[PDB]
């Protein structure tokens, strides 16, 4: 346990650093951080406006010999301005661009929606979206080597197989909001059934490491409460993308690998209350194609 | 050529007529198949559980030996019945399949139905066995990798069940073959099967005379202003959505009139009175409606489709 196997034959690390939208300086002191500490997965999004930064902390570790290129594990992610086909591989470019890679390992579309390109979330910018066109351009992406592997995030199982149904090369992963919080059992299945990969993201929740099945289990195995949620999620066959910039944590949510949560202990995670946290509200609205979370998520709530 | 063939997502090419075969009395269905080849049909469909591949494997040795056709000229389809989905048992009934047809290979295999029973036994309700339709189809794939199948593909799927197949599918279902004729248009299934590079093929495409499909006055009103008659219209429509059909005629003469459906063409004007007939499912599947089964209603089976 270490890496899981994409549908491509590609092993993904099951722990990867997942990065957001923060002050100048930290994501990339943070990637830095977590290469030299043993992470081999990076997760990042043009839509954080970091690539940039990214790139000069993944140029600082090869340059010094921490790591070669194929090494790492680099996911980017297509943005909801961009899913128009013309706009897709000029997307990719970009965010290769700001990286300074030649390749992507994953490129996700970010979201099931869309809007004009250039505009923000506003109802006056919502289209109505063509995930086949998009995928189909996707697929040139892959096929042209720019991405060596391309999924989605945030698709229900209904969506995913939507897709799956219409798609030569198919989505290797669906990268979704999952932790002991919201286990996301349905799309779990779902994706063994296809061959998907789930790759959780928001493994923390910060409630959920409040749980007392969580702290419990915790105080018996002699680990902390994020390293038992992040290794529920791998013991469920799932990569996880903890977000840190604290190396101590950063360290210690890598150590996950080599010990395991018995079955006793694993049943009693049935015995947490189940909530989706990020809900989505901000594509949910009288004027988009989403009118309600359950369309959204199709039932997934 | 002119909608002469379709292509499969293989690649090959399926004749847009072929004979549609049925269970009849000794001999019937053999003399058919040879006078619809040499008439000119490159399609014979088949199903073992009608029991007549063997008489069908005699009419096509009689073609093949006396010269009207070779083996490579036709596009030869049977299909898995209900009581043989069981892994073990797929490989098995395809051989059976091409025992009888004395055929080396099928052109084109598919599931019956979404629905199975107990090996050898018929459709009552101490019989049913909870479909398992992925691991039926993992056992088709194995047919189509050892070439026994050219091509696999299924029958009398829902759009929703077709693309639930899809989605776990490594080779892709090449046929969703249904009851498709003006009476029962299939939009839904149509518009999926084209965003899935799934073939339709339309079987019952008269309405099974032996109905009223033939009669409505829509089809009269176009035969008539189009100088051919009602069945031609009723086939040229779904050569004309691009559907293959099946007609079941045995007579010499709707034989060949069956095969002239390429040359002229349904107008816009026209084709938008299809809309006007009243639609209505004609094979309900109501053999597999149980409470015992997994399709309590009519309307799970046909996933909304009705
Ligand atoms: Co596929």
């Not at 809007?115 to 979206?129: L, Q």
């Not at 999924?151 to 090369?169: H, I, M, W, Y």
């Not at 928001?202 to 969580?214: A, F, R, T, W, Y």
């Amino acid at each position: 346990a270490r890496h899981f196997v994409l549908n491509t034959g590609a092993k993904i690390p099951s722990v990867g650093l997942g990065t957001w939208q923060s002050d100048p300086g930290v994501v990339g002191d943070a990637v830095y951080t977590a290469v030299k500490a043993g992470y081999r997965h990076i997760d990042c999004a043009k839509v954080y406006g970091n690539e940039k930064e990214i790139g000069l902390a993944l140029k600082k570790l090869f340059e010094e010999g921490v790591v070669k290129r194929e090494d790492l594990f680099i996911t980017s992610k297509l943005w909801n301005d961009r899913h128009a086909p013309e706009d897709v591989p000029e997307a990719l470019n970009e965010s290769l661009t700001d990286l300074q890679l030649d390749y992507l390992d994953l490129y996700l579309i970010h979201w099931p929606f869309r809007v004009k390109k250039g505009t923000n979330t506003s109802p006056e910018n919502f289209i109505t979206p063509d995930i086949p066109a998009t995928w189909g351009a996707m697929e040139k992406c892959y096929d042209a080597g720019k991405a060596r592997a391309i999924g989605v995030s945030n698709f229900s199982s209904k969506k995913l197989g939507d897709l799956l149904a219409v798609a030569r090369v198919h989505p290797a992963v669906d990268q979704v909001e999952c932790h002991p919080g919201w286990q996301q059992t349905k799309l779990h299945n779902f994706c063994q059934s296809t061959g998907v990969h789930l790759t959780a993201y928001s493994p923390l929740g910060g409630n959920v490491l409040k749980e007392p099945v969580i702290i419990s289990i915790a105080e018996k195995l002699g680990k902390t409460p994020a390293q038992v949620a992040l290794r529920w999620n791998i013991q469920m066959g799932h990569s996880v993308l903890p977000k840190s910039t604290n190396e101590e944590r950063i360290k210690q949510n890598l150590d996950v690998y080599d010990w395991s949560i018995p079955d006793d202990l694993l049943a009693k995670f049935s015995e947490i209350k189940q909530a989706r946290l990020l809900r989505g509200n901000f594509i949910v609205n009288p004027q988009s194609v989403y009118k309600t979370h359950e369309e959204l998520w199709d039932g997934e709530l």
